[PDB]
Every structure is written in C-alpha cells, then in structure tokens.
Design a protein around this ligand. Structure first.
Ligand code: HEM
Length: 392
C-alpha cells in the first residue's frame, strides 16, 4: 500500500521473493538488472548480461561468502576462494568429477543404484518421486563419486540437513553477532563426523596437482568437502524433478521423451534452464567500488546472481517461462560460468539421465497424480516440494 523503481524496490519482501519470484524478476530485468533490495540487505543480478559479467569478473569481484558460511563451512571454502587457493582446491575436487574419471561408475554403480530405488517404487504402485526416488538416487550417487561409498545414505542425508540448518541460522543482533549459536551445533557435529570418516577419489584429493612431497591436509580440504555435501548431494535429484515437472507441462513432449530416451539430455538441459535449482543462491562480493548502470555496489556487499532469472531473460530466450524441448539451442547459467563454474556440471546430468531413463522405461505412462497439487517454492534455491505420480 502507498499513496517508481526505487519506491517499489523498498516494498519487496523476502516472502514475496520466495513465493512469487517470476513477476518480481520480470520487473527487475526490465527496470534494474542489478538491484538493491532493502528487505534482502543485498544486491540481486537478474539479467543474463549482468549475471555473466559479475560471475566471470575475477578482477573486481570475489566468490561469495558470509558469516554463516565462514561459521559452518570454515575459512577458505572453495565458493569464496580465489587465486592460487581456488586453483588448488579445484585441482583437488574436480578430477573425480571429470567424464573420463567417472565414466565406469555410470554403468557399474549409478544405474544399479537407480534400479534399486526403481524397484522400491514399483512395489508401491505409485510414488512421491522426490523423496521416494530422485533424492535417494542423488544422495547415493553423489556420495559415491566423491569417495564416500562407505558412508550410508542416512548419514549423508543427516550431514546435509545439519549443514543446511547452519547456513539458515542467520539471526543476528545490532553488533552482527549470532544470537542462536545452538543452531550451529548440528553442523559442528557433522563436520567432526566427516573428519572422523576421512582421517584414516581420496588419494586424488591429497595428491593431484601437488608436489609429491607436499600433499594436501584434511583441514585444508574439509570446508570444500562440506560445500559438496551441502550443495552437490541433492542437486542431481533436483534437476530430475525440475525436468520431470517441466515435461508434464508439455504432454506431447513428455510422450515423445517416453518413446525416445535419446531426447533426455536435451530435456534435462531445458529443465535446468526452465527452473534452475540454484536459482539465486550463487553470489559474489565486490573487491572495489563497481557501477553497473545506476547500481553502485561497494566492497563487502552481497551480490546474489539470479541465474534462474537470467535463464528466464526475455533478451536471450523467446517465451522463457515456457518449458520447450524444441527450444532454439542456447547455453544456460544453471551451473554458473567462469572460474567458479559448478564442479559437478558434467556428472550431475549423467546421474539425472540414467535416473530418468530407468523411470520412463519402466513407467512410460507416468503422470502427475491429479488428486495432489505440486507446491513450488523459493528464490535462492527453487523447486517443487513434492511430485506425486501415478502409472498404469
Ligand atoms: C544439476 C545439479 C547441480 C546444479 C544445478 C549446480 C549448480 C551450481 C551453481 C549455480 C554453482 C555456482 C556457480 C557460480 O558461482 O557461478 C555451483 C557450484 C559448485 N558445485 Fe554444483 N550444482 C549441481 C551439482 C553438483 C554436484 C553433483 C557437485 C559435486 C559432486 C557439485 C559441486 C559444486 C562445487 C564444488 C561448486 C563450487 C565451484 C567453485 O566455486 O569453484 N555441484 N553449482
């Protein structure tokens, strides 16, 4: 209620961003590609051009961090790392995620894992695909590829939730001090248990890109391993869910996919563009004063990269709100770009491909259960909250 971009920006709330992000980002792309949102106490980049320019600029921005990220992940986590520290951390975590390295696991581990949960839901006769199928597949396949084959999914899942709860533990006082330190304790305990597991892919972590006499240590690596458990463990499953949901909005395209599995790589890419799971949670911080258009950002301020809005940018895509398997080919920013580009960007679509291959081979008649609704939520991380389905 009032009695004008700046005026409007001051009224936008986090709850509106969480619940109705698309019309907000539609206005932002048009009126303020880099916008300060007072309720978010941060900048948000909404266009393809602004997101790619900020994300790729290794001279004037650094990878994002925050008090919670320092508290939960530890210092020199890979997200906020730059320079030789970042190059070294990428030298540690990237090798097992390259296609030549993970290729044998696809048929030796991933597809057998998928078929285990496929059989589980087959006995059910129907399913809530996210908790019943996509999430267990994602947790197990990411846990395996990063060298935690011997950690059970129940433990990987508890670690994920403890780290997430810690990142969400933002309550602060006027001095910038956390007021709920108890909300970090599950994350602290998770970190201790990860250390307990690893202290006795892994050999690559210590040695790859390092002098044979100077390997890495566990404390140098633990922040970046927690990054993966927090941010990698669930996202292949989220890609499956965004892709499944998008296909259901185009029945004729879903039908085609169920009769031709070679269309799945394209559907999965369009799924990521249509509902980017990491919608605005990526960020950078200015290293010096930066002015883009009318936005003057200053060192230390948070700049969220709304890759999800960039992937819905009318200047790049025609009718970007529509899922379209036959869309004119174009890259997307759902994995980011530049030096911080997702280390899992080659592995995640292969897990998702095999998960959907097996799903549509066994249940080609699969469809959303019309006795249920599909709630969709979030602007930092965005996706469906469940996917109740039926099949013949
Ligand atoms: C479809 C699934 C996934 C999506 C959509 C996704 C998305 C993203 C995004 C948007 C970023 C930030 C890029 C930027 O700052 O510009 C990122 C970073 C990262 N992701 Fe993923 N991710 C996925 C899966 C995974 C998996 C499975 C792993 C590990 C096995 C992983 C590991 C990482 C790491 C280590 C980084 C940090 C890279 C750096 O800062 O240098 N991700 N991801």
């Amino acid at each position: 209620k009032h009695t004008d971009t700046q005026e409007w920006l001051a009224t936008v709330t986090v709850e509106q961003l969480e619940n109705d992000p698309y019309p907000i980002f539609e206005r932002l792309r048009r009126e303020a590609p880099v916008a300060w949102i007072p309720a978010a106490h941060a900048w948000v980049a909404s266009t393809w051009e602004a997101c790619r320019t900020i994300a790729d600029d290794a001279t004037n921005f650094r990878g994002g961090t925050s008090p919670m990220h320092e508290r939960v992940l530890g210092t020199d986590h890979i997200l906020g790392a730059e320079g030789e520290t970042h190059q070294d951390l990428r030298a540690a975590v990237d090798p097992p995620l390259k296609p030549r390295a993970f290729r044998p696991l696809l048929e030796e581990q991933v597809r057998p894992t998928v078929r285990r949960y496929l059989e589980a839901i087959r006995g059910q006769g129907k399913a809530e695909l996210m908790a019943d199928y996509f999430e267990p597949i994602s947790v197990r396949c990411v846990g395996d590829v990063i060298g935690l084959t011997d950690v059970d999914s129940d433990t990987l899942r508890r670690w994920f939730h403890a780290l997430a709860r810690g990142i969400a533990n933002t309550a602060m006082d006027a001095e910038g001090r956390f007021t709920n330190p108890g909300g970090f304790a599950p994350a602290d305990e998770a970190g201790a248990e990860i250390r307990e597991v690893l202290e006795p892919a892994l050999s690559h972590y210590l040695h790859h890109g390092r002098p044979h006499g100077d390997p890495r240590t566990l404390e140098q690596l633990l922040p970046s391993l927690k990054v993966i458990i927090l941010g990698g463990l669930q996202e292949p499953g989220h890609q499956c869910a965004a892709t499944f949901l998008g296909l259901t909005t185009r029945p004729e395209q879903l039908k085609r996919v169920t009769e031709d599995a070679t269309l799945l790589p394209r559907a999965l890419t369009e799924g990521l563009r249509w509902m980017s799971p990491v919608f605005s949670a990526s960020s950078r911080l200015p290293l010096r004063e930066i002015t883009m258009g009318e936005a003057t950002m200053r060192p230390g301020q948070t700049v969220w990269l709304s890759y999800g809005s960039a992937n819905r940018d009318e200047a790049v895509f025609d009718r970007p709100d529509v899922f379209d398997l036959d869309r004119a080919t174009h890259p997307h920013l759902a994995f980011g770009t530049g030096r911080h580009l997702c280390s899992g960007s080659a592995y995640a679509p292969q897990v998702a491909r095999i998960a959907l291959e097996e799903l549509f081979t066994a249940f080609p008649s699969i469809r959303l259960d019309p006795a249920h609704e599909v709630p969709v939520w979030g602007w930092l991380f965005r996706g469906p909250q469940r996917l109740d389905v039926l099949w013949d």
